[PDB]
Every structure is written in structure tokens, then in C-alpha cells.
From Swiss-Prot:
Belongs to the U1 small nuclear ribonucleoprotein C family. Component of the spliceosomal U1 snRNP, which is essential for recognition of the pre-mRNA 5' splice-site and the subsequent assembly of the spliceosome. SNRPC/U1-C is directly involved in initial 5' splice-site recognition for both constitutive and regulated alternative splicing. The interaction with the 5' splice-site seems to precede base-pairing between the pre-mRNA and the U1 snRNA. Stimulates commitment or early (E) complex formation by stabilizing the base pairing of the 5' end of the U1 snRNA and the 5' splice-site region. A zinc finger (Matrin-type) spans 4-36. The chain holds residues 1 to 61 of 159 of the full protein. Changing C9S: Abolishes the binding to U1 snRNP. The modification N6-acetyllysine is found at K52. The gene is SNRPC. Component of the U1 snRNP. The U1 snRNP is composed of the U1 snRNA and the 7 core Sm proteins SNRPB, SNRPD1, SNRPD2, SNRPD3, SNRPE, SNRPF and SNRPG that assemble in a heptameric protein ring on the Sm site of the small nuclear RNA to form the core snRNP, and at least 3 U1 snRNP-specific proteins SNRNP70/U1-70K, SNRPA/U1-A and SNRPC/U1-C. SNRPC/U1-C interacts with U1 snRNA and the 5' splice-site region of the pre-mRNA. Interacts (via N-terminus) with TIA1 (via C-terminus); thereby promoting spliceosomal U1 snRNP recruitment to 5' splice sites. This is U1 small nuclear ribonucleoprotein C. The modification Phosphotyrosine is found at Y8. It is found in: Nucleus. It comes from Homo sapiens (Human).
Length: 61
């Protein structure tokens, strides 16, 4: 599966490498940006499953 995609940003990356993916996730704003993805999922508030995936993704303690 070439090319990478960020469901939180609704965009399609072109270089799915180990530095490009981390380069895309190298800004504290990316966390607040995720709220825009699940802001209207069901007219409610869902700020729990994000910490489980943002912290337990690959190398987060
Ligand atoms: Zn993103």
C-alpha cells in the first residue's frame, strides 16, 4: 500500500516513509486538528478514544 493517508486531516500524503509520516505528525496543532475530524461524528462529544490512539499509536510510553 504505497502513499499514506491521515483520516484526522482528510488528506492524502504522497511519500509514506518513516520520516514523512512523523514529519506530518510533528506539530502540537495536529492534536487540536483531530477535534475537527470527530466534531460532528454524532452531534456529541468524543474526546476519549483519541488519547488511546494518539498516545497508544506506536512509540508513546
Ligand atoms: Zn494529520
Amino acid at each position: 500500500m504505497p502513499k499514506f493517508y491521515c483520516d484526522y486531516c482528510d488528506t492524502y500524503l504522497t511519500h509514506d516513509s518513516p520520516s514523512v509520516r512523523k514529519t506530518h505528525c510533528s506539530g502540537r496543532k495536529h492534536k487540536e486538528n483531530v477535534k475537527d475530524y470527530y466534531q460532528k461524528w454524532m452531534e456529541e462529544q468524543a474526546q476519549s478514544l483519541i488519547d488511546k490512539t494518539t498516545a497508544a499509536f506506536q512509540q508513546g510510553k
